[PDB]
């Protein structure tokens, strides 16, 4: 199962990119409301 970690690490590298992205667009709106509050 050597090819496992050579592969199933790749997806892990992806979802971190998927997480930090979605983590910010909410931060964007999270500040807007305070500007209009």
């Amino acid at each position: 199962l050597d090819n496992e970690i050579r592969i199933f690490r790749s997806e892990l590298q992806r979802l971190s990119h998927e997480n930090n992205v979605m983590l910010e667009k909410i931060k964007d709106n999270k500040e807007k409301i305070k500007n209009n509050r």
Partner: protein
């Protein structure tokens, strides 16, 4: 090993797609700033209506493309912008369930009504009101015009609110009831809007009965000075009359009213042909009070006896609604003697205070 470290991520992401869509929803609403509320007097053209705001003035306005000019007529409630003042949207059904509420099971056709006191009334209203509703295609060809309305007067403290609630429920009629207080208590100068809605709602749920107490409140000044400050106390009678004249008296809507002081009534209308049939109502008698005391007192853990007969013969000069008090006038002495099953001694001295309570 390196699989579980990822399996927590597909859960992570979907746990944000929920979060995102919310924070993206709200901004989609904040741009949609508020509006202002009004009401209509009349109509002039599809390009120009009239309104009356909820803060005084009587603007003139235009109207947007979408809304049907058909539905826009008098009486309607309206919404519009703040600067241009152009009407866009409508909201009907000025709900106030504290005001009224339906009794659909009153359209059961077999409902219970077995409280005491009165039989010929429930016997006769059945005559006054059943036939014009169930198969009224005969009142025309015979020749006469049936009664558009009714009035039920009497002394206070008699429990008639439940009566009219009942007999329209056994007959199988959709009953609704609203006092004439909140319509003038909650709603000072926005009242008669409720009236017409109370009928339209009542219409499309035809057949149906009305009931409404404290009806002597519409009078107010009754044009006691003709000043333009009591427009509410004046118009609130107007919209009442114009609407009940609009029934045509076919046999799918009838009306009931009530108070204590019919001599205080406003026969500016409601006397001649609107509330045509006037019906007084009696008080109990030598056995009705046992027909009454068999109701309330029966519903509590007494000792079990029949001093009622020897009791009420001592009673006299006795109104009706003082009886929920009379039992509890005794209930406030059973607990004092640290009891569960009371005796008639509390009842034999029950009224002995209550007779003086009628003094003031």
């Amino acid at each position: 090993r390196y699989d579980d470290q990822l399996k927590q991520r597909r859960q992570n992401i979907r746990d944000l797609e929920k979060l995102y869509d919310k924070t993206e929803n709200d901004i989609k609403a904040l741009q949609s700033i508020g509006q202002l509320i009004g009401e209509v007097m009349k109509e002039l053209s599809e390009e120009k209506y009239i309104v009356k705001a909820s803060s005084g003035p009587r603007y003139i306005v235009g109207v947007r493309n979408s809304v049907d000019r058909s539905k826009l007529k008098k009486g309607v409630r309206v919404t519009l912008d703040i600067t241009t003042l152009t009407i866009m949207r409508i909201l009907p059904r000025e709900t106030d369930p504290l005001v009224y509420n339906m009794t659909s099971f009153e359209q059961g056709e077999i409902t219970f009504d077995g409280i005491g006191g009165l039989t010929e009334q429930i016997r006769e209203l059945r005559e006054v009101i059943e036939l014009p509703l169930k198969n009224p295609e005969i009142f025309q060809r015979v020749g006469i015009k049936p009664p558009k309305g009714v009035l039920l007067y009497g002394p206070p403290g008699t429990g008639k609110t439940l009566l009219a609630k009942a007999v329209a429920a056994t007959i199988g009629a959709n009953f609704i009831f609203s006092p004439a207080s909140g319509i003038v208590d909650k709603y000072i100068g926005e009242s008669a809007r409720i009236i017409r809605e109370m009928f339209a709602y009542a219409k499309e749920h035809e057949p149906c009965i009305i009931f409404m107490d404290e009806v002597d409140a519409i009078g107010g000044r009754r044009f006691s000075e003709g000043t333009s400050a009591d427009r509410e106390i004046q118009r609130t009678l107007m919209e009442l009359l114009t609407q009940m004249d609009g029934f045509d008296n076919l046999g799918q809507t009838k009306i009931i009213m009530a108070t204590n002081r019919p001599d205080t009534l406003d026969p500016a209308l409601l006397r001649p042909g609107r509330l045509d049939r006037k019906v007084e109502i009696p008080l109990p008698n030598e056995a009705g009070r046992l027909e009454i005391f068999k109701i309330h007192t029966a519903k509590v853990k007494k000792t079990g006896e029949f001093d009622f007969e020897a009791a009420v013969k001592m009673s006299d000069g006795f109104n009706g609604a003082d009886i929920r008090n009379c039992a509890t006038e005794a209930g406030f002495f059973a607990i004092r003697d640290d009891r569960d099953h009371i005796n008639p001694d509390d009842l034999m001295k029950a009224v002995r205070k209550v007779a003086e309570v009628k003094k003031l």
